[PDB]
């Protein structure tokens, strides 16, 4: 399939070169997979989700996304226009309040929730979780992410927006999950993107157009935006049968565009998420 005039990040993930505008992908499009977006929620009513999104959990007085951040991330995973995996099922877990903040204890509860909740969902092709959040180093937060991964979920987490080594942030620093840095449309490391040995992969993160609350759309930037490209890619690849939850981060690294990003610090992977789709 070909989507013309796609957001640059979608075009990037199906291209051996920057500077193109058509997204190419297998029509299966993540059908039969599931992606949890652990964030401020998802506006499930947004026409862009086509009934494929739903809220499954909140820790606050509402499951509504009163921020937009979670809706944007979910859009990059699986919206019809702005998404990588256009037929995946999206599950919202609201661990962040409408200010975009969340106590680590609530975030941990949300991760353990997903590990159990997948057993209540139909995801024959596999399960992914996208965590566009983080804070300072916490062994408990890392351990929760590790459990989620261990349970059979492909966990993708944001590296962070500190232009610093991600070793000092969680869940970014957890070795067993897929830690995602951000790039821009000219294949530069995004200026805010964290880096370091703990990174596994980069994805498009600067000036990313996606869904927003009130049935709208918005361009924003962050490792929060790169993460759902990788989560959606994993779901897409799992539907194709090319990889599994336990192997998807490795597979994505194996098949990434290599050595093409600029301003990658010595010791950080130079790998850009790529679907290796040949139309
Ligand atoms: Ca990993």
Curated annotation (Swiss-Prot):
Keyword Transmembrane part of the UniProt annotation: no
Keywords annotated in UniProt: Calcium, Disulfide bond, Hydrolase, Metal-binding, Protease, Serine protease, Signal, Zymogen
GO biological process per UniProt: proteolysis
Upper lineage: Eukaryota, Fungi, Dikarya, Ascomycota, Pezizomycotina
Binding site for Ca(2+) 2: 16, 260
Role played: Hydrolyzes keratin at aromatic and hydrophobic residues.
EC number: 3.4.21.64
Gene Ontology molecular function terms on file: metal ion binding; serine-type endopeptidase activity
GO cellular component, one term: extracellular region
Domain of life: Eukaryota
Free-text remark on how the cofactor is bound: Binds 2 calcium ions per subunit.
Disulfide bonds: 34-123, 178-249
Positions of Ca(2+) 1 binding: 175, 177, 200
Family: Belongs to the peptidase S8 family.
Cofactor dependence: Ca(2+)
Domain Peptidase S8: 7-279
Gene for this chain: PROK
List of catalytic residues: 39, 69, 224
Catalytic reactions of this protein: Hydrolysis of keratin, and of other proteins with subtilisin-like specificity. Hydrolyzes peptide amides
Name by which UniProt lists this protein: Proteinase K
Part of the whole protein covered: 106 to 384 of 384
Keyword Kinase found: no
């Amino acid at each position: 399939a070909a989507q013309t005039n796609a957001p640059w990040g979608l075009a990037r993930i199906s291209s051996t070169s920057p500077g193109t505008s058509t997204y190419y992908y297998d029509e299966s499009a993540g059908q039969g997979s599931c992606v949890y977006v652990i964030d401020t929620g998802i506006e499930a009513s947004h026409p862009e989700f086509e009934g494929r999104a739903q809220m499954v959990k909140t820790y606050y007085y509402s499951s509504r996304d009163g921020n937009g951040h979670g809706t944007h991330c979910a859009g990059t995973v699986g919206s019809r226009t702005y998404g990588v995996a256009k037929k995946t099922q999206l599950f919202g877990v609201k661990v962040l309040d409408d200010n975009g903040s969340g106590q680590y204890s609530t975030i941990i509860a949300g991760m353990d929730f997903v590990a159990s909740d997948k057993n209540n969902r139909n995801c024959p092709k596999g399960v992914v979780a996208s965590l566009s959040l983080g804070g300072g180093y916490s062994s408990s937060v890392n351990s929760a992410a590790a459990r989620l991964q261990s349970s059979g979920v492909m966990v993708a987490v944001a590296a962070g927006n500190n232009n610093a080594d991600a070793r000092n942030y969680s869940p970014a620093s957890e070795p067993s999950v897929c830690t995602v840095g951000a790039s821009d449309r000219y294949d530069r490391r995004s200026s805010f993107s964290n880096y370091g040995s703990v990174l596994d992969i980069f994805g498009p993160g600067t000036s990313i157009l996606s869904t927003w609350i009130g049935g709208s759309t918005r361009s924003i930037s962050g490792t929060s935006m790169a993460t759902p490209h990788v989560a959606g890619l994993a779901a897409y690849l799992m539907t194709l049968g090319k990889t599994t939850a336990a192997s998807a981060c490795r597979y994505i690294a194996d098949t990434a565009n290599k050595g093409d990003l600029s301003n990658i610090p010595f010791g950080t992977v130079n790998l850009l998420a790529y679907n290796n789709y040949q139309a």
